[PDB]
């Protein structure tokens, strides 16, 4: 079972970000496993001096933490090598990125051309890790709580339609109505990622232009007969945002949908951690409440080893959202697979 | 010197028509008489339209009547973020054009009903953008806080804990009138089991006429709006004082009208006449503004108050020697031609800040908490551009106001 | 805030025809006539359920979907039946089999495309759309089946607007069909994951309440239906009028549904006195609360007293004092504190309109969201499994292109729904 593998990483302050406002020393590093926090701010929470952003100290506990200096390569070293091995083993594996807006989650997931992300790195590792093999890829995005298939050919207007989330003979929920392409080589997968980018919804925010409207789920299933079935899924969730105050319109709706969906994961984990403590005859699991939670049910409650990537923003304004995210990860760490 | 008024929310708009009615009644301004100085904003057409259909239809300008055909939503979130945002723009524009058109204004009298949709949300963002565009003015809001046990909305508390967090840090002085405690007044101090909203509104519409209206009118002891916030709030915190009316006698049952000052003033401190279920169970007064109007002798007053100050049962806070603002107006009260109010030639509209609110807040905090513990209708807020932040960061927030009214008082 | 009614299936059509028979009367709208309205207030909100075209022909904005000619060919050939625009008639001469799968996958699936077209034409009417009304029966093909598709599409084309659903759940004691529990379990599944406000009506609870609260010796369907139509107008339509304390779908929902599942309600009328004799006129207010909050008088089969309450929505409509109402509601919440949930300080949500039902002085729609409705999903699940185990009339489903794990899905879902309801029933 083991506790969920969790790693915490922070992104370096951008030059433009630093220019806008320069408050550093919020996150400090003590030991590779743990993080120490002292955050500065314009003002502290108005109350008796307690947990404020003004000047306060906090402790973070994680498997490993990454500094602003190094990118995906460091993640590739520890995480990419071992996580891919489990999938080859036939064990189910799933990794997703969570964090507040401007945390650079797309950076971790996709990565830049110069610095390949978790997905491109893992793709390389699977070949190294790799008897008859059969492999297929599924790519889809969830926008406004509606699903679209990235595999779909580029067109002016196109809708995949709602995802057929129906539980089959197997107790665990499975996603259907997804187009699948055989994975001959890494490049084929990369090409799917590239074409998927166009299909995937994109938008710009005050925080960052890169901002992804929809959550991205990349799933690759390998069937190997010396047939063992293993599923590796890499998810790129969109983060939470203050931009709601800054912008309105369709952008407001997208944010509202994401913030509701993100919350469902949080409520689920909260119930899950509680379930960990309580023996029985207690609170039910919120998987049924939201579609996202339902799909994730296998990840949280059922089969498959899970690892999580948490991105943190050193910004003081974001501190309340980031603290909640950290709290979420801390709570998640409590329960076991 | 002037002052504008912003009636937001179904209730706040309904009460507005009432409070604004009494005005004209004592100003000789018939239905189609000058141009007012307030506005009505709500996300419910049917209610704002009621002012376009009912009385004083043409007494208002369709420009000071903002409406949002969309959805009202009995929830802060929607009214604040999603929808409310769309409307804010237009609203602000009006309260910026009318604030200019005048000559040296004094502030914006906000009228909202805490546990509402447009009353919670809307106001929240209005006061925010106001405190920045007109930080150098007075922000006195007359609110109608959730009935202690006879509430209406199921979410009610939630909508009031989110509006409190934003008003605390933006408003100067927010007057509060307990909706429930108004029925009591109609039962014990009027005798009538048939009080419609349009009746309850007449009460507030009366006390308020003594606040702005008559006060803005010359007298033997004029009292500016600034005076209030200054002498009523001891700390930057948007302190919420209580509104009270004195001559609340029925113009049918009893008939004792002729009630010398000393008595009409004493009827203000009695818990069965304080327009608020905040019974002086311990709440020590810290500043009171006895606004009189009508035939009142400055000496008669400076005696009736003295006797009270030495009544001991009105125990004032320690760090406060004298907290009695004597406000003397000229024009006597003005009872509706055929309402239910006696009609005396003098009144005592006493308002004050009392650590008593420690109660009222607690009872509303607990409520919220109880529900929050299971998240209940939280998903209804989240899906309107919100998060656990606004909640958790406003729960702990108000908490330091429950501790504040405890620390700043109860201790010598 | 506009809306678009939907009369899915045979039942849903029959009942629909009665709902419009009623509603029209509460807006003075004659068959082909214009606005004869006794007043002028019954016009300030017509838009919500009608359409502006000529100037004397305000056509109801509803949809008539059914794979059985006879139905649509009987409703359009009668009284107010000649008010619906031909475009609204979305019929399907195919085989109207009483199979959920046959009206959702094989026969229903074709006419669906021809539905979306109209549902989009009507939504883009005018003003701002609020939500859609859906009526149907959980004991037939075009009702449970065709109705289960319409929602899955509607709630995907407009995940913003709300979705009210009036379902005529399979009565226990006697089932008016044989596959009934199948068509039910299968339709409830999609409902609990689409619609956000469901009013379960019980064909047998109607009889009862119409045989004891109404000296009616011959309770015809038309009658039964009429009672429903009287209650469903109090919900929506009513709130679309002025009032001391007015409400609307949004307020109503965001105040009655604590958990995203959807939750099921229970419609109840207030003044339910027989014509002649019974006319006591006792409608001061305490008499209304006595009625509504009683066991009998609740359109559901199960009795509220057999399960806590979560929320309540008192939609009053008659000139009254905000004191004798708000107070009473409280007293009741204290007299029956036992079953009324504790983790919620103010379960009841008081609403008070002004204008009453034409010839009546004062009424009050009752919408209770009690966990007592468990004793309904349980029933269904029982009857279901009991025949499912032996695959009774399962071949009639599969043969129309279905899945044997689909039935499992439905059961499971609805069964889990039971779990939740109990987690807050204690
Ligand atoms: C002389 C007089 O006062 O007659 C009353 C009457 O006798 C009673 C018995 C009515 C009568 O209702 C029934 O007998 C009834 C028949 C089938 C199903 C349900 C009820 C009445 O038919 C019903 C009718 O209701 C209305 O007019 C409302 O506006 C109502 N309308 C309809 O249901 C309707 C009926 C036919 C055609 C179009 C509309 C309504 C209620 C809620 C929301 C919208 C509309 C009323 C007051 C009466 C009669 C005429 C005898 C009662 O019902 C209602 C819904 O008001 C039954 O108990 C109440 C008490 C009433 O006093
Ligand atoms: N005194 C008084 N109280 C009122 C009046 N109308 C409503 N209230 C109270 O104010 C609250 C009702 O707020 P709502 O009418 O539901 O909502 P709103 O604040 O207008 O805004 P929305 O929720 O978006 O409709 C309840 O606590 C009522 O008891 C009124 O005319 N007078
Ligand atoms: N109240 C009510 N129930 C009805 C009516 N017609 C059929 N029903 C109920 O609906 C169920 C049968 O489904 P049906 O409407 O024939 O299905 P469909 O026509 O194939 O969609 C039975 O439980 C009936 O009691 C009606 O006019 N009023
Ligand atoms: N570890 C990091 N080091 C350097 N830049 C990063 C890092 N993480 C994110 N960024 C940058 O931050 C920006 C926003 O990151 P992004 O992944 O797109 O956001 P989100 O977390 O919402 O998915 C991008 O310009 C990205 O290159
Ligand atoms: F790209 Al982001 F939230 F801005 F996921
Ligand atoms: Mg309103």
Author numbering:
A (entry chain C): 61 to 190, 296 to 391, 398 to 508
B (entry chain A): 2 to 34, 61 to 439
C (entry chain B): 2 to 44, 47 to 360, 369 to 437
Question: Which of the paper's sentences describe this entry?
Answer:
MKLP2 (Kif20A), a kinesin-6 family motor, is involved at several key stages of cell division, and in particular is essential for cytokinesis in mammals. Kinesin-6s are particularly intriguing in this context because they are up to ~40% larger than the canonical Kin1 motor domain due to a number of unique loop insertions. To address the deficit in molecular understanding of the MKLP2 mechanism, we have determined cryo-EM reconstructions and calculated atomic models of MT-bound MKLP2 in different nucleotide states.
Transition to the MKLP2-MD-ADP.AlFx structure causes substantial local rearrangements in the vicinity of the active site (right), which are in turn linked to large subdomain rearrangements compared to the ADP-to-NN transition. However, in the presence of the ADP.Pi-like analogue, stable conformations for all components around the active site are also observed: density corresponding to the N-terminal end of helix-α4 and loop11 are seen and exhibit connectivity to adjacent regions (right), while the N-terminus of loop11 runs past the P-loop, the γ-phosphate mimic, and is connected to helix-α4, (right). There is also connectivity between the N-terminal end of helix-α4 and loop9, while the proximity of loop9 and loop11 is consistent with a ‘phosphate tube’ structure as seen in other ATP/ADP.Pi-like kinesin structures. Overall, the compactness of the ATPase site is consistent with adoption of a catalytically competent conformation, similar to that seen in other kinesins, highlighting mechanochemical conservation within the superfamily with respect to closure of the active site to enable ATP hydrolysis. In the presence of ADP.AlFx, density for this element extends from the minus end of the MKLP2-MD and connects to α-tubulin, consistent with the large rotation of the P-loop subdomain in this ADP.AlFx state. Helix-α6 of MKLP2-MD extends beneath the core β-sheet, thereby directing the neck-linker towards the MT plus end. Strikingly, however, density corresponding to C-terminal residues extending from around H508, which would correspond to a docked neck-linker conformation, is not visible in the ADP.AlFx density map. Thus, although subdomain rearrangement results in reorientation of the MKLP2-MD neck-linker towards the MT plus end – as with other plus end kinesins – the docking of the neck linker that is typically seen does not occur in MKLP2-MD. The higher resolution of the ADP.AlFx reconstruction facilitates the characterisation of density corresponding to loop6, which emerges from the side of the motor domain facing the MT plus end.
